[PDB]
């Protein structure tokens, strides 16, 4: 409603670096808000794509940002009559970033890993890795829970059970208020999908450079399964957290599986022990139901509500014809211990191939009316197909079925404006929560400031 579409702020990165693929707000020890941006195709040292991370200070003008420097050198360690190898070429550092306290978590879901023992090997596979930084102090650490030292032959013998070689850990990420990093790995367990949790503080204290393979005792991975419904479901494509059990001491996990049960797609709510509470099933196949999940209380009953994106949903139209436009589902949490029923609201896109639902960001209370609001992206929607971000306001009965404001892309065609979103943070300190939008196609980030309601 009251986002300023006239005087934007533009941050920009190198050409072809995909600057804006992922972003988040970052507060330092003094509460001064900044913006962390991931550029998963930034050139490394060897003139090869490795990705990179930038930490933009807040300036109404915008501009270039300083880099958040990470180690981009391939590593090798000969130990235990084995050779451990990491390959950071084309790893996509910055394909997801997330902030919590004065710490940044930037991940490279396609960092490759291999172990050599004489003539055998573990196979060079993308286990994924995340890099952690404390910008003020300069502390650094890494976390890669799917790294293993089991040779290729053993996996064949034990029939690929517990195969964490293709995790791509860091694909999606989130951090609980208690400080527990939760990585999504859609490729764990041979493209079944796993989740990996570990306290941030334990990551920093149990990391030393050059070790490559080290233990984190407080970590907790999910479990393999022999159920064909989870086969090629990419459990962990998107991840989020919230409160869905009634107990305020436990933190619950929301996981997307957009190809679950033969591309039916699903979303599952779990406890911190990965035990399944509820399971929302997809409505239409290949709709990619679960591509994005968001958690916020939209109806103001203190109970977190759930939002699920299915950006390929094909809407039914006249003459038995379908039209891919995308769709978003709203689930309102019921009072007390009860299952989440049917969707409370269906928001369906309008622009063909617009992918309405590719990204969903809680905005907090934008117009300051008592209900939290959200923003939904259609990165190839709008009358020009350049991209659109629609805002939907909260109300006593859920959400409004029609948008209050629509942000058209200021970038050229193909910018993927809206592919990443983040809101609910006041960055100019005017009392109103703001919105940052990424357009990796144009390698820029646009900041929309919320202003008093006209």
């Amino acid at each position: 409603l009251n986002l300023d579409p006239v005087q934007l702020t533009f941050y920009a990165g190198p050409n072809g670096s995909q600057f804006g693929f992922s972003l988040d707000f970052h507060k330092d020890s003094h509460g001064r808000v900044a913006i962390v941006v991931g550029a998963p195709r930034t050139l490394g040292p060897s003139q090869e794509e490795t990705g990179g991370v930038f930490l933009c200070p807040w300036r109404a003008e915008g501009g270039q940002c300083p880099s958040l420097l990470f180690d981009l050198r391939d590593e090798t360690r000969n130990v235990g009559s084995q050779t451990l190898q990491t390959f950071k070429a084309r790893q996509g550092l910055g394909a997801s970033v997330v902030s919590w306290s004065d710490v940044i978590v930037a991940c490279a879901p396609w960092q490759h890993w291999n172990v050599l023992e004489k003539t055998e090997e573990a196979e060079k596979t993308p286990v994924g890795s995340c890099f952690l930084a404390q910008p003020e102090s300069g502390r650094r650490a890494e976390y890669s829970p799917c790294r293993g030292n089991t040779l290729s032959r053993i996996y064949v013998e034990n029939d690929f059970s517990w195969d964490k070689r293709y995790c791509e850990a860091g694909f999606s990420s989130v951090v609980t208020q208690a400080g527990e990093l939760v990585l999504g790995a859609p490729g764990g367990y041979y493209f079944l999908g796993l989740l990996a949790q570990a306290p941030v503080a334990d990551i920093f204290s149990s990391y030393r450079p050059g070790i490559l393979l080290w233990h984190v005792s407080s970590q907790s991975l999910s479990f393999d399964s022999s159920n064909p419904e989870y086969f090629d479901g990419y459990w962990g494509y998107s991840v989020a957290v919230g409160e869905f059990d009634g107990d305020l001491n436990t933190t619950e996990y929301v996981v997307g599986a957009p190809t679950w049960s033969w591309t039916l797609g699903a979303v599952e709510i779990l406890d911190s022990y990965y035990q399944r509470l509820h399971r929302l099933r997809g409505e239409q196949m290949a709709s990619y139901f679960g591509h994005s999940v968001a958690v916020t209380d939209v109806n103001g009953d203190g109970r977190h509500d759930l939002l699920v994106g299915a950006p390929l949903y094909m809407e039914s139209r006249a003459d038995r014809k379908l039209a891919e436009v995308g769709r978003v589902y709203l689930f309102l949490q019921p009072r007390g211990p009860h299952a989440l029923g049917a969707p409370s609201l269906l928001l369906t896109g309008t622009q063909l191939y617009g992918r309405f639902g590719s990204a969903i960001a809680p905005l907090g209370d934008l117009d300051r009316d008592g209900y939290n609001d959200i923003a939904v992206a259609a990165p190839y929607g709008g009358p020009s197909g350049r991209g659109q971000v629609l805002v939907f306001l909260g109300q006593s009965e859920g959400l409004r079925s029609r948008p209050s404001q629509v942000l058209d892309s200021p970038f050229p065609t193909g910018s993927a404006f809206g592919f990443s979103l983040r809101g609910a943070v006041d960055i100019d300190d005017n009392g109103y929560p703001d919105l940052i939008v990424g357009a990796y196609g144009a390698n820029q980030v646009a900041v929309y400031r919320a202003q008093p309601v006209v």
Epitope: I154, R208, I211, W214
Partner: antibody, heavy 119, light 108 residues
Amino acid sequence: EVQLQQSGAELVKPGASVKLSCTASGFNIKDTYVHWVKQRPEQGLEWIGRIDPANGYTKYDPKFQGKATITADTSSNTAYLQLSSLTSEDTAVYYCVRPLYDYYAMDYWGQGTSVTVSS
Amino acid sequence: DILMTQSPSSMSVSLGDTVSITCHASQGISSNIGWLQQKPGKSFMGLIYYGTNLVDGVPSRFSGSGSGADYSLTISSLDSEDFADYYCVQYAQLPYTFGGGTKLEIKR
């Protein structure tokens, strides 16, 4: 806290067999590797072998092939070392070891089990 | 196997002295070395892993260093508890092999 609580001292005859234990306290034995080390005053320290309790796979120094047999039961959170066809030279103190952070290190040590072979 | 030559076999020193134990290997091990302590008539405690990194709970007066095949354990300002045995162990290759040992003794 991490603590490895081994079995009590054993007193056995040559040619017989003995089976030592190493119970985990404050954690899961399945978490890391488990090594066994032999200590004598003259010969110093010697490395026997290791086991991954998650799957049972083991590695041994060629010197102990035949006498040492390492196993583990995730149920009782305990690891075992079996010695067969005992000898006067098998009279030594036996420790179990696990690493702290590095997958391959030797950091935490049990109190040790005192073995004496004698007729 | 890899031979761990630890030297000296023993040394007589006093409280507050800065002493240095060394460990020489039969081949490069690239900082894949650890350090151990066995107080008289007791078990072992970890000190160093991966050449330089301290084990949780160990004081900062200890320190490891060296590369290739030559490494060094150094104790700045000895304490009354620091009089015990000290062994180096390599894990660059299986089987793991230890040093002969080094006993710190009170000088008088």
